Amino acid sequence: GHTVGFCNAYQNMDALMKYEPGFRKIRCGLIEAPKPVSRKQLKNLKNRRLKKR
Amino acid sequence: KTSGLYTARKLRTVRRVNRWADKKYRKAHLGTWLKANPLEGACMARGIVTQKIGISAKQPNSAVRKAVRVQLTKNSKKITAFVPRDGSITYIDNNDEVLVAGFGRAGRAVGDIPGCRFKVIKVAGIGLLALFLRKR
Amino acid sequence: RALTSAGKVRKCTPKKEKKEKPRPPRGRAYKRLLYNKNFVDDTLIHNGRRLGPNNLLIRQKLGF
Amino acid sequence: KSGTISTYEQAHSIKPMKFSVSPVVRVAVEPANPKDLPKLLEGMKRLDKSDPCVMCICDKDENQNIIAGAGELHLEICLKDLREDFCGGMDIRVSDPVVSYRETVTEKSTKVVMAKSANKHNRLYFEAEPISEEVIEAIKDGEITSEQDSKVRARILTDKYGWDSDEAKQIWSFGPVGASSGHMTNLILEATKGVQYVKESKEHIVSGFQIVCRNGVLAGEELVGTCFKLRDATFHADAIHRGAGQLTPATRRGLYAYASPMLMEPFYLVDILAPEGCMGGIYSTMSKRRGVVISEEPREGQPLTEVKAHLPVAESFGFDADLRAATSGQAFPQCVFSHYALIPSSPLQTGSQAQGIMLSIRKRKGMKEVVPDVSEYEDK
């Protein structure tokens, strides 16, 4: 039963949106998980971009 | 012995010159052994067996100890290595890769095998011990 | 009157299937059983006096 | 070469069957540099991965690496590959593989032969007897094996093979290194009590047999189908004068290997199958290569008719192309392997094929030339 954990009690709603780390906000479901890119897809696109503009 | 407060240099020089007198230090630190050893500082080495030969036992034991003439790939130096265990020469065939490792006497020869400085450990990439126990 | 004969003995040795053996107790249980072989019981290792673990006299009191 | 992969754990394998002949055309690759012998074997493995119709094997008898190809052009195509693409260049010499041979005694020996030892204190009298094929077939089958109680094989030999019952019981050992064809037998036994030293001397007559049976008197090839009979012997009382050094050489002169030759013969053969629709090339090629076609079975369901021809291994080189040309690439020599057969000519005669083939063997192995006489190593 014994558990150890930490609580961030934001005085107002905005401070949970701003001061808190973003992953913790999606982990409470406040935002909807987006599909970003594959990182390799970002880097390979940046490398094709670097050859042109 | 030299006994002066200012005789440190002489004492250091004597140790440096006298240290090489012990045979084991000369084998270890001269560097002649590192060039000569068919296994150059390696625990063991791979080779191809040109000839399967048996070396007659030195006295007083009488036996045809079974050996292989192997050409080590790293130095292209042909060597003789004992194939250990009973009737295990059968697994070795000429033109077959083998791994040869020392006899535990640091380049010396053990017991009645005359001039044998190493033992085969693995033939065709399979350990000799495993084959004799029929593990593989 | 005494190279081709590799395995003169190993090839010609009678094959004996190993005796059925009940699985021994492993771990501290083996340490307990070794403690029970000599330090406790004492009757197994005794011919009336302290004796070797594989004595022929100890055998036959242990069966084999 | 080929493999099967399954994500399913419990799935069976798939296998192929290349109709195009087999690795029939064989050649021995040998490096110019002995220190280039490790990189040859390495690039042969890689060349084996390339095509199933090529292989890379060592002949078991002479430890000679052999690359066998399915066509004369395909062996060259794989020799060019092995020469440069594999082994990255390097020097390698193709040659025909050496054909292995066996020696056999053909008839009972003319007379018992004495073998005085170096001490001159011990004498050995021997007779050479060819084993009957039916006994040899049972040796191969295992009805009579070295690894048996002495008496059980004796009953078999006397009760089926018409052997002398006492001789069958006294058989000392089988030959060569293994217990194949080749037997050593003891004396009459009335004089065994009278010989008095054979029991201690048995390990010398056994070790001499293990040598002679490995190397025949004619050309150093393995002896086969022979029974060596110590019809008689006289030995010194002391064991100082009776030892391996004294009696094992005396035994080898007395047994056979130039020392005891009486009737001798060399051996070799192989078997070829040809699916072929046209048998005209089949007969002409076999007749030239000295082979004989012993079979001709039409496949009942197909135009092609399969034949089987016993072909000498020595004359097999060249026949594959000859058969393609004798036919027109319609005939496919398939698998080639089999037993050994008696050479018709005798190694004793001069103009005989045998004495030519026999002298070539000791010239190849560098032993010596022309067997001169039993007198060279026989004591009268």
Next chain:
Amino acid sequence: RISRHRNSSKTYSTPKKPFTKPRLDAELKLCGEYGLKCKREIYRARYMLAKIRRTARNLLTLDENDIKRRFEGAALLRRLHMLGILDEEKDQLDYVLGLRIEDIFKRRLQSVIVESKLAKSVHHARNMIKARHISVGGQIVNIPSYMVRISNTSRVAIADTSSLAPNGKPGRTKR
């Protein structure tokens, strides 16, 4: 990697001579008495005692009340007294010498549960701790060699969920 930064160390010392039978027999007694699975557990406690006694040897040579003697003597005697390896009556650097593998083994918790009658035998006690049925301050311990302390001796007890009016079903009863 800061993983490289993490220190690791061997915790035991092996015997100088492997086959000294008097010692091998004496060790077998300790293993059977204390239910120790392997000789390594016997060597780990020998190492712990060696260091502890090596430190008190060094300390004793230092002159009495030598500042470092006062500072390091306390942290030795007082940490041993808490562990309970030393009975609290002695309380002087002279008597750390005279400790034995049994003193360390006495506080293992395999022994502590046998001592207070909770476990009939050391062999049973090891089996009990590995099934999460023993507790110290209501801590479900899976470690037979817990090395329990003097104050935490009273707290050692059967676990809340194992035998005293608990679920008492999973395992044999559930069938």
Next chain:
RNA sequence: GUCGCGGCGCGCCGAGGGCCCGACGCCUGGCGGAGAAUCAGGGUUCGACUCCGGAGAGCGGGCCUGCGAGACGGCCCGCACAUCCAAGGACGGCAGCAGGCGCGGAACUUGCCCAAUGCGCGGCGCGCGAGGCAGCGACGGGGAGCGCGCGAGCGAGGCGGGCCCACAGCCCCCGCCGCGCAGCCGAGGGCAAGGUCUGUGCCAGCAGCCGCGGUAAUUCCAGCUCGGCGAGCGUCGCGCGGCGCUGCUGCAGUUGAAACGCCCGUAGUUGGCCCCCCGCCGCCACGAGGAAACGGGAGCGCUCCAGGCAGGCCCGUUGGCCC
């Protein structure tokens, strides 16, 4: 000339300068230190790599931009080896992280991601193969198993949920069923444990070493028991200890290995007694001042532990102090 100093360069003018306290030459499978291994003491050996300082980006040169680079994920040239060609041209630089090849006895994934930790740019967040996270991993180190007890039970699993996580997963916590399982070397001596039974007969083999086997084998090959260590054990190579077999401590030289055949002799090393009072020494004591890691060590129950600096309503709560 340079940022400056200086033969740093150049004239000029001398003839110095260094050395048996080993100069110079040669060689290295030479990066150095903090340290690592072993370990009474005095030591020996290794200093790839984790931090610090050096050096280098196929091999030489030369530069530009710069506050700083003689920069190579800049440029130019020669060299060495390449690449694409439409035949005229162009264009390389994994001693970054993956991955291949070659080599060797040997050494991981062609993952996922900036969420931490720092750095760059931006004040309201992007980038980073720095890193973090998994995967592989008997280098190793740690902690538990293979039963207990006559009755109960587990954990290894399996499956959902939490929790965790950048996202998974892992641990852990839950309910719910529940599947415990040993190897590797040995039994003549050193060195612990068969005078058991077969096979074999100086064969095969064993055996570091001494030695075993030539027909009643304590040594081989099996079975049988039994030992030792144990999820590891055996083997091979190396370093240390052993070893006072390198000897400063602390070796030996009549005969075991070893006093030069003798005498003079320079450096070198070593010097009788002698002045109480200081000047310079060396010497010794204690100072400052000097990176951490590590090692030693204070406190602290990560379930114990290898650890980690945590933690608890708290010395200015800690994180001292020693090297």
